[PDB]
Design a protein around this ligand. Structure first.
Ligand SMILES: [Mg+2]
Ligand SMILES: [Mg+2]
Ligand SMILES: [Mg+2]
Ligand SMILES: [Mg+2]
Ligand SMILES: [Mg+2]
Ligand SMILES: [Mg+2]
Ligand SMILES: [Mg+2]
Ligand SMILES: [Mg+2]
Ligand SMILES: [Mg+2]
Ligand SMILES: [Mg+2]
Ligand SMILES: [Mg+2]
Ligand SMILES: [Mg+2]
Ligand SMILES: [Mg+2]
Ligand SMILES: [Mg+2]
Ligand SMILES: [Mg+2]
Ligand SMILES: [Mg+2]
Ligand SMILES: [Mg+2]
Ligand SMILES: [Mg+2]
Ligand SMILES: [Mg+2]
Ligand SMILES: [Mg+2]
Ligand SMILES: [Mg+2]
Ligand SMILES: [Mg+2]
Ligand SMILES: [Mg+2]
Ligand SMILES: [Mg+2]
Ligand SMILES: [Mg+2]
Ligand SMILES: [Mg+2]
Ligand SMILES: [Mg+2]
Lengths: 152, 125, 186
RNA sequence: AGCUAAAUAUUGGCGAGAGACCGAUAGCGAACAAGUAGAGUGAUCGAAAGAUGAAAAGAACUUUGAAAAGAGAGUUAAAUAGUACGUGAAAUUGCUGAAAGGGAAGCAUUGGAAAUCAGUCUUACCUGGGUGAGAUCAGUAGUGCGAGACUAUGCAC
RNA sequence: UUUCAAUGGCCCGUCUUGAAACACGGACCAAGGAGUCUAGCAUCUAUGCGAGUGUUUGGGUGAUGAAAACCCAUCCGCGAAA
RNA sequence: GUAGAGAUUCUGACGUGCAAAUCGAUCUUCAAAUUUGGGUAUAGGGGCGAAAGACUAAUCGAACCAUCUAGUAGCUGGUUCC
RNA sequence: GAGAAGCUCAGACGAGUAGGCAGGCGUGGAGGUUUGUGACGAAGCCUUGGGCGUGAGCCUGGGUCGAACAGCCUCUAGUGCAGAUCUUGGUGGAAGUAGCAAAUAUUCAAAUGAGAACUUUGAAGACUGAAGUGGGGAAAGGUUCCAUGUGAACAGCAGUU
RNA sequence: AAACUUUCAGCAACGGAUCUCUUGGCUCUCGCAUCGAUGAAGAACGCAGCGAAAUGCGAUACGUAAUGUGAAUUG
């Protein structure tokens, strides 16, 4: 497997990825865009706060119809949400990257999220039944997620 | 050039007849040259290989190795030679198959039928 | 803008043969030079006819040559006949006179009978050597409109041309429109 | 009232040899467990689907994780071949970089700006200048009669 | 090459006198996708032979290796007369 | 008037439905020309019809399946490089 | 000499639908030819580099890749797409939108478990209310029955069921 | 100033075009004449150490006898 980027010293970075993860691609993109560039420890704090509805993930691109909240203010937006299912996958991937960095002996105090990317995985297909005996798609939009953390 | 009306040069037919050959036909297809000393002794150029025959590998990464033929995997047109193996991930040694055309026989597993095959093939004992 | 009406703009003639015969190309090469470096209308005539198609170069027989060169007021006694085309035989002429003919092609029978009567056969390059400007030569052509298609060209009411019919006889276009007893005649 | 071989026919069956044929949306519907899966009460209807690698050598072991997995490692000529496997286009998408943006965008002409690309020049040939060493060059002698070219033995030093 | 400024630039295809049309088809991309082959006929051209022309209905070298090449007789077609 | 059998009105809900005919309320009939299981007969210019051209497997002013059949189209659409 | 299919000098002229003709460009396969290219990388593909042509198109650098392929003269055809409510496949914007609201209704504690609004146990609160949400059958299904496990897919939320 | 939108490129996806291949098809030619009440064609159900579809076979069941070959089968 190849990560989409190498924006760090190979010897001073760690990697984690997840493939075919059954969580919404659009929500995951918004989470990734928000935690990218954060320090690893603060990313964990922010993700836990989103779980508690103390902070929110701003929805910037896939925002059609998203509701308004005073928790978007800190990011200068009005549309934000708390996609906890996507949060959990990122929390587990961040934990994996941390353990990978602990295995390479990096200084676990300057670790920064240097790269995070969500790609749309192959869709999984279900059916839904519509009026007048019709059948239409009921697809899932799983995601591929990769994370690179590095010393600042 | 071929001239017989009973011989086909069709690539499709030749490949079908080779890869679809039955077990007894594949035995003749898996033949090896005899060594120079053996050719003169028995007046025979080549023979179908056999288990318990002694060969040396003449081509490939295993060229120059020697050993008995432990098995003749005819389903794969492959010979398994003793002590010609490679290491699996878990340390186990996996045998490496070699084509019969890529070895030369240095000692025959002679027996009653093999002796009959040499005389029938015009050779000597 | 300019108000020019253009009718005879592109010349309608052949500037070279359609044939790929290499020897015809060699003859054209010879007569391109001769028609250019002499003032002879004969050489320009030969060059032009060397380009022409088969239908525009009808054959002529040795009978027609013998008749055309033996008129009462002829003086075409000992002159070379020239045709850019094939010279055929006429077996009806039982006795062939002594003739000198220059032609593209001679039929085997025509050539044999000309020679046997003491005459001579020349190719057009041999003619160029003997009469480089065509002096004292009879330039001849075969009959252009003797071919079958000219029986039919111009067919129409009261034109007396031949119809295109698959077969000949009664029941094949000899009825209404071809006689008074069947409506009208032509 | 009657029989009869051969020369003739042959998109079925069986066996065989070929082709300026098609090359996986093509060629039979079917290159693959295809008249199969599936549909219809029934008569009938009827698909989709080929390719890791020379060889599974199909990733030991360590570590994080409830796990799926990840990260180290490992095998391989190649993992930019990991079976969701040759190559791997486009639509479509994420990240990064660049740039632009007052109710569309795109295009054309001309230049600015920024970015980026090519000149390899004055090589060849000729002459002059400096030193240097060297089997030494024009006319000739001789070896197809008259004239012309050539090589070759010497001299011309 | 990108972008800016100035000037110009309506959405293609189609039927139509006339399409930017408030006429129809066209969300997007790949791959597929429509004047062919045959029995004739007509003009024109090329080639061979020419008052003739056409070996392939057939038969032969032939067995070797032969759907080819090559050779060979009598008819017959078209033409030489309306 | 209940079970059962219907289906008047709301021109109610629904109208990319719970549903290719359903849901609510209202309403008709409710001991007979009543309702109904299973067996059985009638088959396509045929059946069957207390008759609406109704019904005959979501199909009916002539079912469904295959074939004739690439049916014909003076009509519509398309028809590929410089 | 100047591919005589060549070379050279001069003058006039240039809209085009339907339509006609000519000369070219590109594709599969056939004969011939080119001590043709190629695992020291053919073909194919990508390109924020270069060159040629009025154009169809062609050549080339870099990247990717892995087994074949091209030039010239001829032969040949199932030979060139933007359209056909074209065919088959793939994939978009609409969109994290419409929505997932009939059938009164759930709550507490414990156990199990990585994880419990949905499993199991106890407690409470309720409903069907005998023309039943109860207990059986006929038709139809066909193993759906039971136990033990599992929890990828399915159970349009969840999953230890 | 960001976010956002748009275009291009690198990389990563999605998808499976392209290229190369081909135990298949299609077409031509040559050769041959052999089903069944002595139960055919077709259908069903069974048979292997671990075998469901195909091949094969029939309670003698991936087979018995007989003949040939002559060391395999193979997950
Ligand atoms: Mg988008
Ligand atoms: Mg809304
Ligand atoms: Mg529905
Ligand atoms: Mg490679
Ligand atoms: Mg304007
Ligand atoms: Mg018009
Ligand atoms: Mg228009
Ligand atoms: Mg109209
Ligand atoms: Mg219309
Ligand atoms: Mg439309
Ligand atoms: Mg195409
Ligand atoms: Mg209503
Ligand atoms: Mg048609
Ligand atoms: Mg039709
Ligand atoms: Mg013009
Ligand atoms: Mg083709
Ligand atoms: Mg290459
Ligand atoms: Mg591009
Ligand atoms: Mg130019
Ligand atoms: Mg076509
Ligand atoms: Mg298209
Ligand atoms: Mg068009
Ligand atoms: Mg369309
Ligand atoms: Mg909603
Ligand atoms: Mg109640
Ligand atoms: Mg109650
Ligand atoms: Mg019960």
């Amino acid at each position: 497997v190849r990560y989409s980027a190498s924006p760090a010293l190979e010897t001073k970075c760690a990697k984690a990825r997840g493939a075919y993860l059954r969580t919404h691609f659009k929500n995951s993109r918004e989470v990734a865009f928000t935690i990218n560039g954060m320090s690893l420890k603060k990313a964990f704090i922010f993700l836990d706060n989103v779980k508690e509805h103390k902070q929110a993930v701003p929805f910037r691109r896939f925002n059609g119809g998203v509701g308004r909240t005073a928790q978007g203010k800190e990011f200068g937006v009005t549309q934000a949400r708390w996609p906890v299912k996507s949060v959990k996958f990122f929390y587990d991937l961040l934990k994996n990257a941390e353990a990978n960095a602990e295995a390479k002996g990096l200084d676990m105090d300057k670790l920064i999220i240097k790269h995070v990317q969500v790609n749309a995985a192959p869709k999984q297909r279900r059916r839904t039944y519509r009026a007048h005996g019709r059948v239409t798609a009921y697809l899932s939009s799983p995601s591929h997620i990769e994370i690179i953390v590095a010393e600042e | 050039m071929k001239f017989s009306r009973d011989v086909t040069s069709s690539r499709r037919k030749q490949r079908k007849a080779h890869f679809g050959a039955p077990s007894s036909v594949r035995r003749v297809l898996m033949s090896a040259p005899l060594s120079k000393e053996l050719r003169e002794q028995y007046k025979i150029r080549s023979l179908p290989v056999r288990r318990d025959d002694q060969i040396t590998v003449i081509r490939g990464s295993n060229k120059g190795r020697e050993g008995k033929i432990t098995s003749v995997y005819r389903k794969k047109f492959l010979l398994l030679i003793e002590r010609v193996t490679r290491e699996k991930a878990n340390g186990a040694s996996a045998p490496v198959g070699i084509d019969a055309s890529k070895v030369v026989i240095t000692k025959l597993h002679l027996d009653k039928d093999r002796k009959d095959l040499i005389v029938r093939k015009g050779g000597k004992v | 803008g300019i108000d020019i009406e253009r009718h005879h703009v592109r010349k309608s003639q052949r500037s070279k043969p359609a044939s790929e015969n290499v020897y015809l190309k060699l003859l054209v090469k010879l007569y391109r030079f001769l028609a250019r470096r002499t003032d002879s209308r004969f050489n320009k005539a030969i060059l032009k006819r060397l380009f022409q198609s088969k239908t525009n170069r009808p054959p002529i027989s040795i009978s027609k040559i013998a008749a055309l060169t033996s008129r009462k007021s002829a003086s075409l006694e000992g002159k070379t006949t020239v045709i850019v085309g094939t010279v055929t035989d006429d077996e009806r002429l039982l006795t062939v006179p002594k003739l000198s003919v220059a032609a593209l092609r001679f039929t085997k029978s025509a050539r044999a009978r000309i020679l046997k009567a003491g005459g001579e056969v020349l190719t057009l390059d041999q003619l160029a050597l003997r009469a480089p400007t065509g002096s004292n030569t009879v330039l001849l052509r075969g009959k252009k409109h003797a071919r079958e298609a000219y029986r039919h060209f111009g067919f129409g009411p009261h034109k007396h041309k031949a119809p295109y019919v698959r077969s000949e006889g009664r029941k094949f276009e000899r009825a209404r429109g071809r006689r008074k007893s069947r409506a009208f005649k032509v």
